[PDB]
Amino acid sequence: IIKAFGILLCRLKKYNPVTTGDINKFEFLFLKASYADKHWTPPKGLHENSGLETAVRETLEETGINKDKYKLLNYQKTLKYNVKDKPKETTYYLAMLLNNEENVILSDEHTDYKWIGSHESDTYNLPESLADLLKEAEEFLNK
């Protein structure tokens, strides 16, 4: 079972079109893989040798954002997918930025970053499981 771990990093939206109803004030960091499928995902990476150690290191390497720049919230999820018919699990840990204006620094693994919401799932061509992830995360963040 191949294991990947990432941090689902959220921030507060800088603007809301509507400030009336029950709304989604939050948005998650998504990097666009520079190769192959050009996948959009949260920052993540392969376990080596704690899943959170993995998450924090790969998030650092992938975005330049260290653990001290964000607060790990009490929510997580595991997505199971088969890679070339080999069982894989990716666990994401919700974390919110302390500074809403923290700047993403990409490595050569990605070409683009966007802060998105669960409603933008299809536009970003996210698998139903990552959309589920975003949905649940928003449920948690807005409760």
Author numbering: 5 to 53, 56 to 149
What does the paper say about this structure?
The NpnN, Ap4A, Ap5A and Gp4G levels within cells are primarily maintained by Nudix hydrolase superfamily member Ap4A hydrolase (Ap4AH from hereon). Based on sequence analysis the P. falciparum Ap4AH (PfAp4AH, EC 3.6.1.17) was predicted to be an animal-archeal type which cleaves polyphosphate chain at the fourth phosphate from the tightly bound adenosine resulting in asymmetrical cleavage of Ap4A. PfAp4AH can asymmetrically hydrolase Ap4A and Ap5A molecules produced by PfKRS (and probably by other Pf aaRSs) to ATP + AMP and ATP + ADP, respectively. PfAp4AH folds into a conventional Nudix domain, with four β-strands (β1, β2, β4 and β5) sandwiched inside two anti-parallel helices (α1 and α3).
